Amino acid sequence: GTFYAYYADSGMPTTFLFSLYLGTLLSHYYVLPLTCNAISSNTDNETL
């Protein structure tokens, strides 16, 4: 029933950010779409 998050902005191995007691089973995740006037082959060639 506890959520745990680790991250790294430098190197590959992650380090502990935080833990959070929820008491409920998480069951889904979703990467939110990002809308932008940039980030495409016809404007800057960048990609998410």
Add this chain to the structure above:
Amino acid sequence: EHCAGFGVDEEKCGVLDGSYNVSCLCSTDAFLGWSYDTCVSNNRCNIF
């Protein structure tokens, strides 16, 4: 983790001629599989 939820008698969720204008919900007696008792013994409530 906590209880995922009480089982609902689905034959008590919605209304008999209910169209799409009404939203789905169940009456309070539709939730089953639970019970209660007092915690009181000798004028004190017992706690774990």
